[PDB]
Amino acid sequence: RRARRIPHTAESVAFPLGGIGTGNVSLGARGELRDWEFENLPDKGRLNPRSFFAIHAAPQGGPSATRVLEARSSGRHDRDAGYGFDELAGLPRLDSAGLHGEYPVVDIDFTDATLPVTVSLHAFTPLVPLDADASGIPAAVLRYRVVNPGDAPVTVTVVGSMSHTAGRGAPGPDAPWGMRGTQSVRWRESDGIRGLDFDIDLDHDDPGYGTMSLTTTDSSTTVKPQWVTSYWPDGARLFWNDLADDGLLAPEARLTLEDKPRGLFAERDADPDAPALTEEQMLAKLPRVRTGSLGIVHTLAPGEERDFEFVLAWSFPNRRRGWHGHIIFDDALEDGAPDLRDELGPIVRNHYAVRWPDAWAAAAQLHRDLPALEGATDAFVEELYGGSLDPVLADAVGANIAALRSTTCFVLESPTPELGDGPVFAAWEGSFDHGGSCEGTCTHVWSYAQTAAWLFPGLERSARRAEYLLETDESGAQKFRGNRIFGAPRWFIGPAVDGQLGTFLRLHREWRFCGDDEFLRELWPAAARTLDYAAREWDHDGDGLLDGEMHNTYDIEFHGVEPLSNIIHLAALRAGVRMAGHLGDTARAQEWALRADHVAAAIEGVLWNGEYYRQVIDDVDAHRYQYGDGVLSDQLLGQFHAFLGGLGYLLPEAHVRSALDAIVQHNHRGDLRDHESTQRVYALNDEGGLLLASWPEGGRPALPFVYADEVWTGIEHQVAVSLLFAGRYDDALRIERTLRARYDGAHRSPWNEIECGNHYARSLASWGLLIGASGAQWDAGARTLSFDPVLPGDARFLFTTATGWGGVEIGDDVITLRLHGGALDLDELRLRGEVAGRGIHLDAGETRTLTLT
Amino acid sequence: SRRARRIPHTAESVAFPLGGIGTGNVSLGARGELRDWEFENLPDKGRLNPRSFFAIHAAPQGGPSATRVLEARSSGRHDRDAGYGFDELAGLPRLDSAGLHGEYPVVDIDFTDATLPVTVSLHAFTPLVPLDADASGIPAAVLRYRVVNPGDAPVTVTVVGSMSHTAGRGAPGPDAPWGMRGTQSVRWRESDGIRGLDFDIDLDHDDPGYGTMSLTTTDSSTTVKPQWVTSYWPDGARLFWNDLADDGLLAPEARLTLEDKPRGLFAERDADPDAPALTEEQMLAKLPRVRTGSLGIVHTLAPGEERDFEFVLAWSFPNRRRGWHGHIIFDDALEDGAPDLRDELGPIVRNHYAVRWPDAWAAAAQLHRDLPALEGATDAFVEELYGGSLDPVLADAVGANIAALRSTTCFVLESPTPELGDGPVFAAWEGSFDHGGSCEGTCTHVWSYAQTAAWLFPGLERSARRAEYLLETDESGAQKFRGNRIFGAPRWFIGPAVDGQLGTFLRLHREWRFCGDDEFLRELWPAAARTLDYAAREWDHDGDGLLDGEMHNTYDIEFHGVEPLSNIIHLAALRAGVRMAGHLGDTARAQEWALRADHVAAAIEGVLWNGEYYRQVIDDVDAHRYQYGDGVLSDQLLGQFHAFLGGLGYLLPEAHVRSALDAIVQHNHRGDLRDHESTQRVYALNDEGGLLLASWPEGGRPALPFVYADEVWTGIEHQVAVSLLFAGRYDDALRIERTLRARYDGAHRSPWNEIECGNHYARSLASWGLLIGASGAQWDAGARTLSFDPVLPGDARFLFTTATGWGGVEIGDDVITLRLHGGALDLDELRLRGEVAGRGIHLDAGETRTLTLTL
Ligand SMILES: [Cl-]
Ligand SMILES: [Mg+2]
Ligand SMILES: [Mg+2]
Ligand SMILES: [Mg+2]
Ligand SMILES: [Mg+2]
Ligand SMILES: [Mg+2]
Ligand SMILES: [Mg+2]
Ligand SMILES: [Mg+2]
Ligand SMILES: [Mg+2]
Ligand SMILES: [Mg+2]
Ligand SMILES: [Mg+2]
Ligand SMILES: [Mg+2]
Ligand SMILES: [Mg+2]
Ligand SMILES: [Mg+2]
Ligand SMILES: [Mg+2]
Ligand SMILES: [Mg+2]
């Protein structure tokens, strides 16, 4: 296998299935399902009762074997009440496993000393670049490949057993058995698929309502649609008895073995010769989760390999209207915007529910379209992980896509009439284990996130329209957390300099990617105002440099004069000139171009110290949370945006390189055992990482900004991307190797970079590594595509554009474009600053090799 | 040189619990970290106490200083969802490694580090004084850091404890800003011969969440920051570390907040933007409500010098909400009969320890003032339990499991019900979930397994027997197996369990035999005798003397047919009944019971014995769910465990008892569980071993056997190993114990926490019987006789207890020595291996007597 084998003992490792906005379930390195979080909230560590795969292998004329299809557990076994009944941890398992993840696809290869067959699991949820719907199906393929390496036929049953997740409620008389409603399960065969269809009797508009399914297209099935529900776990024992007996299953004659509540379960007030309860009446007194099993049965010849293919699908269509987070409280709202919530009502739907209002619909789609969906997914994996990128960089780019497809992000169906009809992308900053982290598609965080802008640009556009149409007032003040997507009044807190101007940079990015001038024009009156706001409101001494108190991503305000704000502003001005001039807004184009030149001069005159850019302040201790002559890792965040936006260097190339080099030299730690931090920990011990700031020349405040001693993968990524554009390949690679080692499975999961929450949005800065490594520059307005790889010689990269995606392959004398999705109609193709092709058009499925001479 | 085997700092499960009987607890991990902060009348495994940690500043003369948290480095998962948070101070430098050496109640944690210019060890304990439940119930612990200077220059060392109070948390909402329903306080205090930090909270004194804490020393060489800065951001910790790492000295903060008014993200929406600053007091009212302080002790160590930096951590949460408030005995499960006193009695029951000690400081002051005697007793205990002849495996099993008795699982109430009169009453959960009690009501079917308190704190067990007989036993002799009436509530409506009810009667005999108090027995005797007669009357439907048909038991199901668990317990109960009846002059009842017992033993042999073991006789093992038939039930001879411990000897032919025990071992013990198939709960798995509850070596497995048959319970493992020691099957006892304790050797589970339905599970207290069976200790307080009969020949040395006193017994063929460490002992006879060693032996604490044995 190409991916690195992660052993079954790496307990943190979780490979997430599910798509954009769908919610998720993960596979651990034991091959177990974990982190069941379908229900519009995170739920790391949620155990789904009785939900597992199992194998019965019956060698012809030989003893049978029956195992759960999981490697052995390891680690702490001191659960407070033991592993519970519903975990079935006492059933026999496979000795070991290795997990090989190339997100969105995983392979988990099992090893066992005695099982008479060998097993692997291939799993994925499709990902189709530029197709957010196809990439947002609430379902996953679970495909178990079984090999008979023995000399006699083996009859193999692979059986998924599953419980629906819906229905939990807080303990109480409205939630007997912790369940607010009662589940159902049945066998179903319709829509070209067969299997188990789960439901619940909650109201159609209850936020907790949802469905699940476990299906196959395999005709060779054996089923127990509904396990027995008794007070004791009879269901499970009967299931195992049924499976290990013969590798076949039957429906249960009786759905409960209780006649009436007795012994410990007796109702104190029951009439002791009440009439017999019907089974339905007895079921009404019992636990409300339901479980079924779908088995697929094949006799494998000596040597034969066969796939046992399932789909697991789910649908929780209803969200409560509002973030219901921990920041934007209904008493932290400012007056001024109409409160639409009573009129619009208490629910907003997930977008995915328009096509797939229940699990069956999603399953049926995934099975019907599997060749194309899988074909796309596989082409994506091959381009992303099978080209010339160093494996570390492919890992950083690819694995972090998981954040975009996690509970951190979601897509709402028409949440507010003010944006018109259609999907609106919105996101937390991250996911706490059990709730959202930091609501409002936070602009100072999300400005670092690049992945969606290149893979699902539609989503990012929908978000920019919320910020400009709803969250930007007449003066140009833009909220950095948005509440108006729900119809709710705005958050009362004011603008952040990085969030407001980062948003403006993202408007440029979005427009550059799609080429849609109408998109830009709609947002332009508000966007221009936000750029004007900065020079007017944030420069108190009229020198062109933003100064004094401005709020930033560090949750504090910087004072004095300093590069984070100023270099972002410089980039925004440059972007603003491009957009203004294109749109014919000649007054702003001129005004901003003058301003930009003046700012760049003033940055070099004031903030540059001959090695890096730093904060000019009278007294670094006069206000808490400053940094002064410290080296701020984000000093050049503006330049990261500029490189990615095709704006090149904002400042003298040698000065930018010096500054980057200072960041690497001073702020990168190979080992953190001696680091003296009172802050949050995302790197420690024998790990390394880029610090947010350090003070190599002294001047450390008593109380520096409150995250200065921390390590943020997002900042690591942005700096590495800048280093790539600057030609500092070795250092970018070292940053990325070091940070991804913290996420190699030993202590943290590859598919979950963390900050304030799991699947943290800043981690999506990582996509810029592909861009920087390849020097990809797509301008949809010019219809030009160019590459300029940092490393010389032969190369092969994934690329995206608005209209199409594929692979680029570069040699001495030729460049090849192969398109896997959509279409490409280039005015011009450039390689290393030279014209490689004019008028170059390709359709999906076509390859063109162009001579460079 | 440490006697306990070294547990590495990488063993994440390991937690050495400080605290005493009924006090609540905090634990030490193998990194030397404090963890599992659970002082407040409920379990709380995994609760992190913000800003609560020890650190060292080591300033070598003429060398670079080192400032470190006095913990080894963490080593497992680091993927906390938000990172390690500010208040964990996980980004401060730590030590390369540590080795934990626990001989409960004492622990030593030895740090190793390549950069620190001194070497550090932590010695910690909460005193344990056998037979003194109060002295063993101090809500405090000693934390004594030994620092050695192995280098070549003097080093000025500061060892600093920083600590937050735990009190005040509230459910999310407007009255719990920052998650805190009250505001804590901390101050420097010097009083009662001690000094340090005194923590309080502005909750009402009767609030269940009210309490205090203290961190004190008697060292005069202190440096202190009594109250860290409270700002919106964690300025306090930054200032703390700047202050420590600068010079190893601390100062009080001139400003208790660095906020002038709420600003920025914390600004109040409606505030006037140019509002003036608030006072410091008004500003603190708007800020987080936990308070932190730091007590440092400073000494300069010459090359080769060592010094103790001694702290005491103490706490007090005096108030419990009246009632179990568990998950079984809800209002819809309450019986009409006994009237509801709850409204008449008032909403709070106090912890017993809160009678003696008003607050944390009081308990700290006691512990410091009395420390030489308390520690002396504790050290003498440790030496007898762990420094004698027992195989270390056995000493481990006996001593580690005491933790359960001193955990949140158990507590002691001040006078919860007028119906028992005034005084402390012991009560217990079966266990402790991570964040709540497991299975309320001093459950009798579970607690009948527990032996530790009956030998170490018998008074506690007597107080509980009174609740059962006076409160939970009706006029027919039906006894509840979960007791709600201690709180003045109606009884639970569920009826008796055969093992619970008869197990409690066996424990009455046990308690009476230990103490020799006929008045204790007489008060309970009418109720107790009715509970024994209840069995033969109500549970034998075919007149054969054997209990038959539907009887509920510890497996939470009912056995049908006729089967040994019930019947061999009954046999044992009858034999104990005869002793008690005979002594009290209830001569007619003694005779009746003796003859009934003779008939029961004969019927057991004639019906339940199959030539190899005892089993369930039933027409169809599948006619009723949850049976076992011809399976081997590990608990078949539980009655015989009681009988052995109660001095009653073999209940059945010796060869048959040994055969059955051998069959339990042979059939139900597993060295490895890779091949095991269980749809049940997991307490043992994979490459572990254990004793299964049942197995079917000759077939006859029901489709749905009892619901725990395929499980492994340490309590059952212990009871069987105890019986095996009595029966002379030492090797097999040791094997069961070796295998079970290996499950709790720190690799996957903690030595100090055997688990079943909950942490610190009461059944694990069967482990005390290993000492009794290994030593063959037989104490009869009514006869004033003490005998030993060790399973292994030759020289031996054991802990022993009696009602009046405790100590060490040293045995050879030439002499037997008693050394009494506490109390007194007045023996009419001392016997060894059935022979009189001496008569008229009178010892006081601190004395020894060595008797030469006859040739
Ligand atoms: Cl899109
Ligand atoms: Mg959790
Ligand atoms: Mg349905
Ligand atoms: Mg079958
Ligand atoms: Mg200025
Ligand atoms: Mg490591
Ligand atoms: Mg075509
Ligand atoms: Mg075309
Ligand atoms: Mg917990
Ligand atoms: Mg006080
Ligand atoms: Mg100082
Ligand atoms: Mg009866
Ligand atoms: Mg009978
Ligand atoms: Mg082994
Ligand atoms: Mg192991
Ligand atoms: Mg000798």
Author numbering:
A (entry chain A): 3 to 855
B (entry chain B): 2 to 856
Question: What does the paper behind this entry write?
Answer:
In this study, we identified four enzymes (two GH183 endo-d-arabinanases, GH172 exo-α-d-arabinofuranosidase, and GH116 exo-β-d-arabinofuranosidase) from Microbacterium arabinogalactanolyticum. These enzymes completely degraded the complex d-arabinan core structure of lipoarabinomannan and arabinogalactan in a concerted manner. We propose a d-arabinan-degrading pathway for Mi. arabinogalactanolyticum based on its gene cluster and four characterized enzymes.
The two structures are almost identical (Cα RMSD < 0.19 Å for all chain pairs), and we will mainly describe the complex structure with β-d-Araf. A dimer is present in the asymmetric unit of the ExoMA2 crystal, consistent with the SEC measurement in solution and the PISA server prediction. ExoMA2 has a two-domain structure consisting of N-terminal β-sandwich and C-terminal (α/α)6 barrel domains, the latter being the catalytic domain. The two-domain structure resembles that of GH116 β-glucosidase from Thermoanaerobacterium xylanolyticum (TxGH116, Dali Z score = 42.4 and Cα RMSD = 2.5 Å), whereas the amino acid sequence identity is very low (21%). This finding indicated that ExoMA2 is an anomer-retaining GH.
